[PDB]
């Protein structure tokens, strides 16, 4: 499913993402925008380490989810990567919360650092009444 801007904001907010670990809703929005364009079915294969990024937040199969075909995989989120390609993002959010619980925080995602960190990201939520 491809969420619309404010549809996503309102949802991420009811799922407790706004301010989660000091991370504002606009920052979670900015991450999703650049990682997948708000598309839950987004995927990206990484040839170097044979892993795949799944979903709206592009959660990697090597450490966070199990897809069954990645070498030396851990399943820190304890879920099938398959669950991260679903229309209902409740699982993707829970797993995104776990990722940012590690010391690196949201900086775990390179895209966020290159496109969101230290930049005005207010555009992502202005007009959503969130």
Curated annotation (Swiss-Prot):
<feature type="disulfide bond">
    <location>
        <begin position="65"/>
        <end position="81"/>
    </location>
</feature>
<dbReference type="GO" id="GO:0031640">
    <property type="term" value="P:killing of cells of another organism"/>
</dbReference>
<comment type="similarity">
    <text>Belongs to the glycosyl hydrolase 22 family.</text>
</comment>
<feature type="disulfide bond">
    <location>
        <begin position="30"/>
        <end position="116"/>
    </location>
</feature>
<feature type="active site">
    <location>
        <position position="35"/>
    </location>
</feature>
<feature type="disulfide bond">
    <location>
        <begin position="6"/>
        <end position="128"/>
    </location>
</feature>
<comment type="subunit">
    <text>Monomer.</text>
</comment>
<dbReference type="InterPro" id="IPR000974">
    <property type="entry name" value="Glyco_hydro_22_lys"/>
</dbReference>
<keyword id="KW-1008">Amyloidosis</keyword>
<dbReference type="GO" id="GO:0035580">
    <property type="term" value="C:specific granule lumen"/>
</dbReference>
<dbReference type="GO" id="GO:0019730">
    <property type="term" value="P:antimicrobial humoral response"/>
</dbReference>
<keyword id="KW-0964">Secreted</keyword>
<dbReference type="InterPro" id="IPR001916">
    <property type="entry name" value="Glyco_hydro_22"/>
</dbReference>
<dbReference type="GO" id="GO:0003796">
    <property type="term" value="F:lysozyme activity"/>
</dbReference>
<keyword id="KW-0081">Bacteriolytic enzyme</keyword>
<dbReference type="GO" id="GO:0050829">
    <property type="term" value="P:defense response to Gram-negative bacterium"/>
</dbReference>
<dbReference type="Pfam" id="PF00062">
    <property type="entry name" value="Lys"/>
</dbReference>
<keyword id="KW-0929">Antimicrobial</keyword>
<feature type="domain" description="C-type lysozyme">
    <location>
        <begin position="1"/>
        <end position="130"/>
    </location>
</feature>
<keyword id="KW-0732">Signal</keyword>
<dbReference type="InterPro" id="IPR023346">
    <property type="entry name" value="Lysozyme-like_dom_sf"/>
</dbReference>
<feature type="active site">
    <location>
        <position position="53"/>
    </location>
</feature>
<keyword id="KW-0326">Glycosidase</keyword>
<protein>
    <recommendedName>
        <fullName>Lysozyme C</fullName>
        <ecNumber>3.2.1.17</ecNumber>
    </recommendedName>
</protein>
<dbReference type="GO" id="GO:0050830">
    <property type="term" value="P:defense response to Gram-positive bacterium"/>
</dbReference>
<dbReference type="GO" id="GO:0042742">
    <property type="term" value="P:defense response to bacterium"/>
</dbReference>
<dbReference type="GO" id="GO:0005576">
    <property type="term" value="C:extracellular region"/>
</dbReference>
<dbReference type="GO" id="GO:0070062">
    <property type="term" value="C:extracellular exosome"/>
</dbReference>
<keyword id="KW-0225">Disease variant</keyword>
<dbReference type="GO" id="GO:0005615">
    <property type="term" value="C:extracellular space"/>
</dbReference>
<dbReference type="GO" id="GO:0035578">
    <property type="term" value="C:azurophil granule lumen"/>
</dbReference>
<dbReference type="GO" id="GO:0042802">
    <property type="term" value="F:identical protein binding"/>
</dbReference>
<comment type="function">
    <text>Lysozymes have primarily a bacteriolytic function; those in tissues and body fluids are associated with the monocyte-macrophage system and enhance the activity of immunoagents.</text>
</comment>
<dbReference type="InterPro" id="IPR019799">
    <property type="entry name" value="Glyco_hydro_22_CS"/>
</dbReference>
<keyword id="KW-1015">Disulfide bond</keyword>
<dbReference type="GO" id="GO:0006954">
    <property type="term" value="P:inflammatory response"/>
</dbReference>
<feature type="disulfide bond">
    <location>
        <begin position="77"/>
        <end position="95"/>
    </location>
</feature>
<keyword id="KW-0378">Hydrolase</keyword>
<keyword id="KW-0034">Amyloid</keyword>
<dbReference type="GO" id="GO:1904724">
    <property type="term" value="C:tertiary granule lumen"/>
</dbReference>
